[PDB]
Symmetry: C3
Subunit: 271 residues, 3 copies
Amino acid sequence: GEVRRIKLYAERLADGQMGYGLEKGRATIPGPLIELNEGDTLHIEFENTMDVRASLHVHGLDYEVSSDGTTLNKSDVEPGGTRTYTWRTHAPGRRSDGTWRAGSAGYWHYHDHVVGTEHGTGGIRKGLYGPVIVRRKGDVLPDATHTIVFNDMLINNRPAHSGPNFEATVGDRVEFVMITHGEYYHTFHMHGHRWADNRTGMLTGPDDPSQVVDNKIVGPADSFGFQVIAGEGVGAGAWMYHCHVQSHSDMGFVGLFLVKKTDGTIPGYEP
Amino acid sequence: GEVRRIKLYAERLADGQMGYGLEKGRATIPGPLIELNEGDTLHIEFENTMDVRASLHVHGLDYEVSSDGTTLNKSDVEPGGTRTYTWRTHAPGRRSDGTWRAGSAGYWHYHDHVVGTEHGTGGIRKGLYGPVIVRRKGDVLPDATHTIVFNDMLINNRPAHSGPNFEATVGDRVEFVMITHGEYYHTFHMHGHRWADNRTGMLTGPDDPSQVVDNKIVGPADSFGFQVIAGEGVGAGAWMYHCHVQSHSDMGFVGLFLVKKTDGTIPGYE
Amino acid sequence: GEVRRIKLYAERLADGQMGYGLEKGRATIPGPLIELNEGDTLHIEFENTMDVRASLHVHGLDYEVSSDGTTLNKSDVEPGGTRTYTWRTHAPGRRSDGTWRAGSAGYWHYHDHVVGTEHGTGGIRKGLYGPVIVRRKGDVLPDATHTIVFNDMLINNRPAHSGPNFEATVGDRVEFVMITHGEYYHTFHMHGHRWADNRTGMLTGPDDPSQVVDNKIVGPADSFGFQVIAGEGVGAGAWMYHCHVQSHSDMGFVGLFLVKKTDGTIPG
Ligand SMILES: [Cu+2]
Ligand SMILES: [Cu+2]
Ligand SMILES: [Cu+2]
Ligand SMILES: [Cu+2]
Ligand SMILES: [Cu+2]
Ligand SMILES: [Cu+2]
Ligand SMILES: [Cu+2]
Ligand SMILES: [Cu+2]
Ligand SMILES: [Cu+2]
Ligand SMILES: [Cu+2]
Ligand SMILES: [Cu+2]
Ligand SMILES: [Cu+2]
Ligand SMILES: [Cu+2]
Ligand SMILES: [Cu+2]
C-alpha cells in the first residue's frame, strides 16, 4: 500500500477536443493510463486549465463523496481551478460476518462528470476519459497495454479510417483495456484472438468455467480488459478490431492490431 | 422446502397505471417482493380486478404450462377473474448421470403477459412487474432489499427527477434487485459501491474469478442483484445510482442511495 | 486431433437471400452446423457460386490471415472462385509463462465479410451465417442441437410469425446455439427453462458461481449456447422462446420449444 501522487490537467486541445494529461500541453485521448496495486492510495493534483467547469470521476475505486467529481457532492472544479482527488483501493479479505470482501482489482476508468451536462455528456464526447487498472498481488503483467474506447461512433475520438493501430511482435503479452461511452451499445470484436469473460480476461486454470469469447456487447461506462499472446496459434498479421454492429463497422471505424514477426515483417495487407 | 400461499391482485391505478398488490388498494409499482428458499412451493391466488384480461408470468422458477400466464397456454385471467398460479423451486444437485442440475436460486421477476399485446407490452409499460428472490441454503441475508426497475425511460414508473431514493446507515448490508423492461438497453451504475457479476452479486471467496463491476449493460427482462456494505471503504454520502447512457442520465433519471452516519447525518449535498 | 475436409458453397437463394450449403442447390439459412473437437483441423474447400465477392470468416477458432475472409487480408473469393479456408483448434494448456491458455471450445459462428460492404453487412443480412461448435474432451453431448439466429428483426431469416419450432421429448438433453447479427441488440428468453452464463451453459458443480438465467442480452456477432433437460421440473408443453424487447416480440418474432410427454402428447 503506497501513498502516491500524480498531477493531472484537463486541457482544451487545438482541434477543440478536451483531454487529460500528466503535464500541461501533453493531454491525450484517451487520458493517461493510471495503474495501482490493491492497497495503494493515489492523490491526483488536478488542475482544470479550461474556461468551463470540469471534474474527475472514477469507476470501481474507493473514494469519499468529496472525490465524487459531481455538482451534487460539491466536487467539480471551476475554470482554472485546482482540486486534489483521492482514490483508495483495498485487497480482498474475510470480513467478521464471515463474508468475502471483493477487492478493488479490475479494469476501470475515469471521466468528466460536469462538462456540457451534470453527467459529463459534453466532456466525455470531447475526450475527457481515460483508463485505470488496479492489479491484485500475483496478477500477470504485460509487455504493453493499449486502451480502446468506443465513444459514440468514434474509437479514441479518431476520424473514420484513422486507426488507432497498435503494434506488437509475435509472442508478446499484450493487454487491452476496452471502455465504452456515450449513447450507443456496441459489440467489441478482435480477429485472430480470444479472451475470458472474467475479472482478468484470462482463465485462472481448467476449473474456470468463464465463457471464452472474441465478441462482447458493451454499453456506456462499461469497462473490461484482457491479455493475449500476440499471434498465438494464428501468426503474424494485421488483426482487425472493430464494432460488430453492422452500420457502425461500415462507418469505417476499424483499428488494426499489427502483429509483426521477430524480423519486423508482417504479411501484406491492404488498409 | 415449505408450501406457501399468498393472494395477489392486479389493479388499475392513478395516471393510467396498473400494479400488483398483496391487498386491494395496496398495489405498488414495482409489485410486492416475493421471497422463496430453494425447494419452496408458492401458490398465488391471483385476482384480476381489471376490465381487461391480465396474467402473471415468472422468470427463472419452475412452473407448468398451466401457470405460464400466456394466451398460448390458456393461463391468463378473464376480467374480474381469479386463477391460482403455482411456482415451484428446486435446490441444485447431481443427476443420476453425474451432471450438475442448477438450482432455482437467483434474482428473478414476474410480470403481465397479456395486457395490450400477447407479450404484455401494455401491462409492463403501465406497471405490472415485480421482483422475486430465490435463496440457497446458507446465502447471506441482508438488512434491507431495494428494487430498481428501468422500465423504458422510467425508474419504477416515476417521472424524470423523482428518485426513488433509498436510505441506509454506514455498515448496513443492503441488497439491490435490478430489473429492466420495455424497449431500450440501459447501463446500471452506482457511485461508491461495486459488486460481483455472478449469481449472488458477491464473490464466493478467493477462487471466484467473476468480474467486479459498478456498471452493467441490461436489456428488457434482464434481472440481477447484489448486496453491498453501505459506505464500505467510502463513508456516508448521497451516492447516486443512474443509467450511464448519457441521454438517459441527462433526462434526470437518477436516484440517491443515502448512506447516513450512525449519528443520522450525511455529508452536505445539493 | 483429426484433419477433416468439407466442401462449402455460397449461393443465391429465392426471395433475395444467400446461403451456405454442403452441396450446390442445398444451401440453408442458417448454414450447416460445423462441429469440431479441440485439436481438430478443418479444411473448407469453399466455392463462391455467386456474381459478387463473398467470404467465410469464423469467430473463436485459430486461423491465419490467409483465412481471415477479409478485403484487408485479400482472403475473400471472387465470383465463381474457389478457396480452401483452414480452421485449426487447440486444447487448453499451461503456458511457459505459468498462465492457462484458453482452448478453442465454445459456441461460435461463421459468416460472410465482403457482400454489400467490407464488413459483410449485405451477406449477413441475406443469410450468409452459420453455427460452429467446438467441444472439449469430456464435454456432455446432447440428443439434439438447434440453432436460433436473431438477424436484425428476423429469426433464421424467417418472416414474422414463422417459428422456427423445435420438438423434443421430456428428459431429452437439448442443445441450443444462439447467434445474433445485424443492427440491433436483443434479449433472448425461453419459458420453462434456464441455463448457466458460462462456457457450456451448464454449471460444472457446486463450485461454479455463474449466474443462472433465462434471459440474456445479445448484440451483433455474439454467440452463446447451452443444454437443458427438456421439461425438467416443468413438464411437457409448448414452451415459447422469443426476444424480450417488447416491440420485437410484438412483431410475431416468436417460436416454440415443443416438449412432448413420453406418450407423444403436448398439453393442448
Ligand atoms: Cu455518475
Ligand atoms: Cu458500435
Ligand atoms: Cu469481425
Ligand atoms: Cu471476426
Ligand atoms: Cu461514470
Ligand atoms: Cu497495397
Ligand atoms: Cu414470454
Ligand atoms: Cu437508460
Ligand atoms: Cu461513477
Ligand atoms: Cu418475461
Ligand atoms: Cu470483422
Ligand atoms: Cu429482439
Ligand atoms: Cu418468461
Ligand atoms: Cu464477425
